[PDB]
Design a binder for these strands. Structure first.
Ligand SMILES: [Mg+2]
Ligand SMILES: [Mg+2]
Ligand SMILES: [Mg+2]
Ligand SMILES: [Mg+2]
Ligand SMILES: [Mg+2]
Ligand SMILES: [Mg+2]
Ligand SMILES: [Mg+2]
Ligand SMILES: [Mg+2]
Ligand SMILES: [Mg+2]
Ligand SMILES: [Mg+2]
Ligand SMILES: [Mg+2]
Ligand SMILES: [Mg+2]
Ligand SMILES: [Mg+2]
Ligand SMILES: [Mg+2]
Lengths: 205, 170, 159, 48, 293
RNA sequence: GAUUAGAGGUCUUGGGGCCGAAACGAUCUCAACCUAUUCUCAAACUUUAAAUGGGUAAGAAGCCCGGCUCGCUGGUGUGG
RNA sequence: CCGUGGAGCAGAAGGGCAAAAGCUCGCUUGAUCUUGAUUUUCAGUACGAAUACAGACCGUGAAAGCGGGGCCUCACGAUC
RNA sequence: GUCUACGGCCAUACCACCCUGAACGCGCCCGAUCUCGUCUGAUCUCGGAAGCUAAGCAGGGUCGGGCCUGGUUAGUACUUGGAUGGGAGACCGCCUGGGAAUACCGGGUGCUGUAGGCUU
């Protein structure tokens, strides 16, 4: 029903988001952007693995969803139902257009909205998996088999950060012990030495 | 100790009657209000048009007036005598003002005239303090600080101590 | 094609800077412009009277007429293959003294003073601004500490 | 029978092959466009 | 709950007004039209008369604007009146008249122009304007700066304007805001304005107090009794004040006394102090909590 | 202006239930809400903000003096 | 009580505006007569629109001032 | 040291709370015959001087928010000019020059003009 994906692979037009000017845009197929045991703390899923793009291109929203489904299926098969947490870090915001032919020709050849794609730069994360330390080859294999749902070339990288945070794992535990960052939900709060002393007293009490 | 003139005084008392329709009812409400307050009140036009209450844009639907000083505490004394010096915890605002309502007017010392009929009204009092005119004077306007403003507890204490009233919970 | 409106494409050029809206500071009104000063044009959208056309924004001209509220200035405009020195009237808000001329004036006063001086002394002094000459020879002293090695760092991926 | 609508491809070369001459600056510029009452004064001063 | 209005974004985007506008002292909209000279007049000064009625004083100044800040050429204060005779009543309409006249005469006396432009020596309270005398320096001209005062009929700023106009300054005005203009008849009562200038409106008030009440009169005019001023003599003392002002308007500065260099307000503490403070606060809290636990 | 996800608060309301005659009295909750965070965006968004670029100046038509005219502006042979 | 504009300013949009350009009153007809100069499209021609002046009669205000239409960007027409 | 009148630059000046203010001053404050204006002498206008720093205001404080100014990010992103450079492309590397912005980490928290006071 939809045109081949090769017809919309390169970032050839300016970003064309859905707004008051671009109306009637059909809903993107991907709606869920993370799943697994997302309701988990930061100290039980230390291992983090990214799938990083190696090409500057645009990935279809549906292909995003297909890769997510494949990764989730392999993960629930391998590391149990709630031993992982997926996160797709690309939202499809650039809508593409189609000038359908039914005979005017090329007159008035401005296309109607067809679908949505996400523009991906070199070295940009596509999917992220957080899980326990021992499921490293499981994460690698899940991302590797999810790679087949995308065009272009992608790489797998085991991040040195702790989970879905911006802090290195080799002193994350030391810093939380020292109380420089406080855990919350699935992330952490940095606590600089700048607030009023009341907060310092509150969190040292 | 205490500051001799940071004490609490009432600075204005507002009376209003909202009838919801213009006409003979409105002018008779204005008449009873001006007889009560000893001065001419004013009419307030409707801000918007809503047909649920049967009102439109810019017609007089309410009559209100304000008083200061002597007449203010006399009218407030009459109102509290009608309300047997009884008020509720929620009757007081966070800014230190308060108020109440009287369902009908002839009880507080008004002769019943059958032509004008019967009308209730709202009393409101704005507790003040010497120096509150800074907030609204023209030349060098400013705030009134943090210590100098009035809170709900201070209003409660002033009411229960000066007019020996009771604040029943509610 | 485009539109020939007088203010087309000026939404950023005539706008006010961030956190600088409001009353125009009075120093702009309290400056003196005489006949012949070199002056800059910068349209200010706060006042709409006597606003210069967008093509003179950022241009520098010469004052030739002073009037109650505005100033007439001669400024060059490049039209196709020719330049026209045309005179426009701008209200005083959209105008500002050019500091490119005062530097030359101060230099003139200063080198005239140093020419008047040393005239009796008979010594020689340089007035023309020579371009930046090549660096002369000198010695770089190491203080017993040898320069440290610099090597490229190994590649290792971040993202 | 469509045709090209607008271009300026050769215009810079055409302008430069004769040179964009600056306006002929020269002393004693004309006094037209000057404030009428100030001009009337200058005439009176020159007269007397 | 509810949004917090004074949000970090609110403070980031907030733009403060001018300092004088924040303090409420200056109306810049009026100042722009008041103090700006025409561009073809170049650096010709545009003098203006500032009149400011305080709770206890009248300030009258002559100023012209300059980029670094407007400069005061002459100034006169109401509290100088006791030197000339007015011992009490430094804020009323009469005091405004005397201080305006004093400012005018002081300007001319500084300025070498007393023998010319004497003005209304005999106060009449009617429409008077000075004309330049040919062959002589032109009359000083300035414009009133009412500031934030409400310019209704009978304002003391207009009283000071009338005082200076009778002094000799040429200030454009009309006899509409002077006390005495009757709105309905649209007419001007020079006699009423004259009695307001000479202070009879206080004389009849004090006689009215004499009519009925004594303690209230003492409360209203305590310093009047202490200075021994009677309702009838106020006109004579104001006439004497006008005569003395026109006689000797020059101002002599009070001699300067050497300072003992005593600081009366707390100085700003340094970074080392304010860092040691927080360090020892943390230490004290830790040592208190380790025991309280 | 779009946009994902969990954290902590309360009655500010609604939804499933529960003890309750009822009670913001109470139990979970799901929510909307608030406060700190977090993922991803803008040709017709922006606090910031390049490189390339567009004007102007780099003296004799300039500087420094002395003096005249003016019906303009003028506290002032003031300003121009 | 808080409230930097999150409202309004006839209309599209953008810019601009807080003792105001917004709201409410008071008084008025500078939306008037007249010669020139300049900007915008530009050939550097018209029309249209606009900008500084100048000369009279005025309006308003205590006054400085402001005003010869609409806060600016559009709302219009040769020869015979 | 500091204040008042008029200001210039318009947060290093704003916002929230707390502490202190000698003298002058600025204020709060006391009244409505006259001037003037309101539903209301609340505001404005007018006539005063019993009391008070309570408030405004001034100075100071906050591991304060903001703001201003630096370091880091970073020679990273981007980019003038060049190649018969690589690559199927998408794009990337190099040569010749210029060179940012968040997060994060420091420092600061009004200067000043004219006139007139107080600190005898
Ligand atoms: Mg096919
Ligand atoms: Mg394209
Ligand atoms: Mg073709
Ligand atoms: Mg052709
Ligand atoms: Mg005014
Ligand atoms: Mg106004
Ligand atoms: Mg005219
Ligand atoms: Mg209008
Ligand atoms: Mg009063
Ligand atoms: Mg105080
Ligand atoms: Mg205090
Ligand atoms: Mg801070
Ligand atoms: Mg000072
Ligand atoms: Mg001593």
């Amino acid at each position: 029903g939809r045109r081949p994906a090769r017809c919309y692979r390169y970032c050839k037009n300016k970003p064309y988001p859905k707004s008051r000017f671009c109306r009637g845009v059909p809903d993107a197929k991907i709606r869920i952007f993370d799943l697994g045991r997302k309701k988990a703390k930061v100290d039980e899923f230390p291992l983090c693995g990214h799938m990083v793009s190696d090409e500057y291109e645009q990935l279809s929203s549906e292909a995003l969803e297909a890769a997510r489904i494949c990764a989730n299926k392999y993960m629930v098969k391998s590391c149990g139902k709630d031993g992982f947490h997926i996160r797709v870090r690309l939202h499809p915001f650039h809508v593409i257009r189609i000038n359908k032919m039914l005979q005017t020709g090329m007159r008035g050849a401005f296309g109607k909205p067809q679908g949505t794609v996400a523009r991906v730069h070199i070295g940009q994360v596509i999917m992220s998996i957080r899980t326990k330390l021992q499921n490293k080859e499981h994460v690698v294999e899940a991302l590797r088999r999810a790679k087949f749902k995308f065009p272009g070339r992608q790489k797998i990288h085991i991040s040195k950060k702790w989970g879905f945070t911006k802090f290195n794992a080799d002193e994350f535990e030391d810093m939380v012990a020292e109380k420089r960052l406080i855990p919350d939900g699935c992330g952490v709060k940095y606590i600089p030495n700048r607030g009023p002393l009341d907060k310092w007293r509150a969190l040292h009490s | 100790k205490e500051n001799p003139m940071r004490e609490l005084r009432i600075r204005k008392l507002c009376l209003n009657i909202c009838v919801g329709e213009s006409g003979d009812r409105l002018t008779r409400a204005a008449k009873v209000l001006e007889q009560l307050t000893g001065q001419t009140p004013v009419f307030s036009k409707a801000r918007y048009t809503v047909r649920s209450f049967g009102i439109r844009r810019n017609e007089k639907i309410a009559v209100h007036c304000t008083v200061r000083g002597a007449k203010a505490e006399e009218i407030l004394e009459k109102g509290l005598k009608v309300r047997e010096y009884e008020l509720r915890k929620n009757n007081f605002s966070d800014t230190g003002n308060f108020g109440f309502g009287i369902q009908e007017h002839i009880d507080l010392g008004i002769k019943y005239d059958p032509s004008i009929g019967i009308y209730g009204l709202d009393f409101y009092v704005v507790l003040g303090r010497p120096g509150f005119s800074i907030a609204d004077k023209k030349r060098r306007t400013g705030c009134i600080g943090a210590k100098h403003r009035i809170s709900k507890e201070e209003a409660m204490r002033w009411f229960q101590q000066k007019y020996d009233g009771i604040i029943l919970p509610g | 094609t485009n539109t020939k409106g007088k203010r087309r494409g000026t939404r950023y050029m005539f706008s006010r800077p961030f956190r600088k809206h409001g009353v125009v500071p009075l120093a702009t009104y309290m400056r003196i412009y005489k006949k012949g000063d070199i002056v800059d044009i910068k349209g200010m959208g706060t006042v709409q009277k006597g606003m210069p056309h967008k093509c003179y924004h950022g241009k520098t001209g010469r004052v030739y007429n002073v009037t109650q509220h505005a100033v007439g200035i001669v400024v060059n405009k490049q039209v196709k293959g020719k330049i026209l020195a045309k005179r426009i009237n701008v209200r005083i808000e959209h105008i500002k003294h050019s500091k490119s001329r005062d530097s030359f004036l101060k230099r003139v006063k200063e080198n005239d003073q140093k020419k008047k001086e040393a005239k009796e002394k008979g010594t020689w002094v340089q007035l023309k601004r020579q371009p930046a000459p090549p660096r002369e020879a000198h010695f770089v002293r190491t203080n017993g500490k040898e320069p440290e090695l610099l090597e490229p760092i190994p590649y290792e991926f971040m993202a | 029978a469509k045709s090209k609508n607008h271009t300026t491809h050769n215009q810079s070369r055409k302008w430069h092959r004769n040179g964009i001459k600056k306006p002929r600056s020269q002393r004693y510029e004309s006094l037209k466009g000057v404030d009428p009452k100030f001009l009337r004064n200058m005439r009176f001063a020159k007269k007397h | 709950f509810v949004k917090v209005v004074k949000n970090k974004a609110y403070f980031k985007r907030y733009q403060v007004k001018f300092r004088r506008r924040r303090e409420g002292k200056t109306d810049y909209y009026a100042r722009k039209r008041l103090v700006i000279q025409d561009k073809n007049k170049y650096n010709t000064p545009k003098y203006r008369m500032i009149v400011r009625v305080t709770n206890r004083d009248i300030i009258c100044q002559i100023a012209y604007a300059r980029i670094e800040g407007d400069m005061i050429v002459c100034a006169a204060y109401a509290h100088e009146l006791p030197k000339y005779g007015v011992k009490v009543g430094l804020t009323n309409y009469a005091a405004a008249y005397c201080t305006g006249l004093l400012l005018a005469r002081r300007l001319l006396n500084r300025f070498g122009m007393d023998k010319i432009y004497e003005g209304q020596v005999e106060v009449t309270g009617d429409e008077y304007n000075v004309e330049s005398i040919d062959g002589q320096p032109g009359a000083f001209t300035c414009y009133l700066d009412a500031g934030l005062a409400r310019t209704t009929t009978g304002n003391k700023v207009f009283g000071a304007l009338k005082g200076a106009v009778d002094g000799g300054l040429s200030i454009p005005h009309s006899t509409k805001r002077f006390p005495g203009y009757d709105s309905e008849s649209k007419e001007f009562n020079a006699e009423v304005h004259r009695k307001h200038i000479m202070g009879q409106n206080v004389a009849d008030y004090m006689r009215y107090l004499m009519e009925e009440d004594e303690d209230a009169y003492k409360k209203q005019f305590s310093q009047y009794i202490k200075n021994n001023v009677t309702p009838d003599m106020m006109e004579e003392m104001y006439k004497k004040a006008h005569a003395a002002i026109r006689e000797n308007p020059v101002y002599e500065k009070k001699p300067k006394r050497e300072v003992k260099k005593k600081r009366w307000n707390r100085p700003k503490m340094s970074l080392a102090q304010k860092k040691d403070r927080v360090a020892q606060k943390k230490a004290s809290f830790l040592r208190a909590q380790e025991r309280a636990a």
